[PDB]
Design a binder for this molecule. Structure first.
Ligand SMILES: Nc1ncnc2c1ncn2[C@@H]1O[C@H](CSCC[C@H](N)C(=O)O)[C@@H](O)[C@H]1O
Ligand SMILES: Nc1ncnc2c1ncn2[C@@H]1O[C@H](CSCC[C@H](N)C(=O)O)[C@@H](O)[C@H]1O
Ligand SMILES: Clc1ccc2[nH]cnc2c1
Ligand SMILES: Clc1ccc2[nH]cnc2c1
Lengths: 268, 257
């Protein structure tokens, strides 16, 4: 009935979130081994690329929701949108992205990811061009709280409404339970134009994951629960696919059983 | 021969395989053209077999990137000790090895089989069995009883012959010599400079025989080849860099009759 406590537990916990430990855990090998095609890294990139390759998802503006310190989620996207907004709750994540944007050395190195995207998009693009294009198309990096009814604040910088939304491993990772999840989904939906698209990626049946000192709580959701929430928010589900986590990628960083990918189109 | 004694491998790599000639991002550059020729040729599935030899490899490996998934036993060669050492460093992942990874990535891009560049390099490294001395001026260019499995099912050679040959006839004999290493029905992929006469490798100033496409064709024919394919890349102004006077590059696919 009342959300404050749960939300406050969530904000408290993320106060200990360590971005480098998160990157190492989920984006360095073995999870970051893009050489095995049966691995989660290549499956993620594939979903994005295949989705954008339909040409059916385009426009001027895009908002990435809960970017964290990662950019892979925008590699295939950046060729289809002039204007990209990145976002995160945590300043320390916003700074991490700042470092990649300034092309500093001390930044996380996404080049294997960039190269792989270029590889599977099959336009023969070099990875440096791809990266240079993402850095150009990222127009701002903003604070976000998906629990607020206006997740970006009032009269925010972001072009509203966006033609498309991307969100990866955010909603379920910051929502104490399924009702919270649903509301978060409902809040971000106010940012998308009617007829626009949402690409949603996340963890299935996950209850915790590590990010350094911080052990964080996740609402474990199923595919059927994700579909239902999407429908319940005013979306037509165009695609919902599931990746089952192989034992060898279950590393003790979380209890994730699998990953879901959703392409949904806002009805209107 | 004495001219090749002053030959600095890093200065050659830097002059030809680093920017601008080594920027693989523009598809109109000489780098991408070369890899495209190699890749396209192997993708035909007609250049196949068990053993292959690369003639005058110098300190470079790119010429085998697409090849290496078609031949389980690979032999690399060069006249100079220093080049053989520079190859060693990259094969053995040693310190101060040249970084070929942009080229690996591009072969993977071009071949379009969704391969990661690390697997490509791994396979190449595994399939190169030996790096041997060679002198194409010799009738048996490899010497008497070489470690190399002869005759080979195929041959590669890039920028070697025209660059070790004073004139057309010295060039034609060199071709005749290496052609003896190639099993009849075998395949030659030959790449070289068009109408070039000199190029620099650090302190070394090397002499080259200026050859034309028609000259290259006639030579392969006279050596006993059926020219399956012969293409030319004209050298753009922006890639004419003071390190030589190459006018174009040629790629030849030939098959010993
Ligand atoms: N109340 C809130 N509203 C929106 N984002 C939040 C939030 N609380 C935490 N986050 C962000 O949720 C992210 C989960 S990590 C996901 C990182 C990136 N999307 C990738 O795909 O891996 C963290 O960056 C965290 O800071
Ligand atoms: N008499 C000879 N017989 C065989 N190779 C020779 C030779 N004299 C010089 N070479 C080698 O010919 C090479 C020319 S340059 C290296 C070409 C390399 N394959 C690439 O594609 O760039 C040098 O490595 C040089 O040392
Ligand atoms: Cl397997 C996997 C991949 C990425 C993730 N981000 C958060 N949890 C994850 C789990
Ligand atoms: Cl443009 C170019 C590329 C490779 C070469 N090797 C010898 N001369 C060259 C010239």
């Amino acid at each position: 009935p009342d959300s404050a406590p749960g939300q406050a537990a969530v904000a408290s916990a993320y106060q200990r979130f360590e971005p480098r430990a998160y990157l190492r855990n989920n984006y360095a090998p073995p999870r970051g081994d893009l050489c095995n095609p049966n691995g989660v890294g290549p499956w993620k990139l594939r979903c994005l690329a295949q989705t954008f390759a339909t040409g059916e998802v385009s426009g001027r503006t895009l908002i990435d929701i809960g970017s964290g310190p990662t950019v892979y989620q925008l590699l295939s996207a950046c060729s289809h949108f002039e204007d990209i907004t990145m976002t995160d709750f945590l300043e320390v994540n916003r700074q991490e992205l700042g470092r990649w944007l300034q092309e500093e050395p001390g930044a996380f190195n996404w080049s294997m990811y960039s190269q792989h995207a270029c590889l599977i998009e099959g336009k023969g693009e070099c990875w440096q061009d791809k990266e240079r294009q993402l850095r150009a198309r990222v127009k701002r990096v903003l604070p976000i709280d998906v629990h607020q009814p206006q997740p970006l604040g009032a009269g925010s910088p972001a072009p509203l409404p966006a033609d498309a939304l991307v969100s990866a491993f955010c909603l379920e990772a910051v929502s104490p339970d399924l009702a919270s999840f649903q509301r978060a989904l409902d809040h971000i939906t106010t940012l998308l134009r009617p007829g626009g698209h949402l690409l949603l990626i996340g963890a299935l049946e996950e209850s915790w994951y590590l990010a350094g000192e911080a052990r964080l709580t996740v609402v474990p959701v199923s595919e059927e629960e994700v579909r239902e929430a999407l429908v319940r928010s005013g979306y037509k589900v165009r695609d919902l696919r599931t990746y089952i986590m192989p034992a060898h990628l279950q590393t003790g960083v979380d209890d994730v059983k699998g990953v879901f990918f959703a392409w949904a189109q806002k009805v209107g």
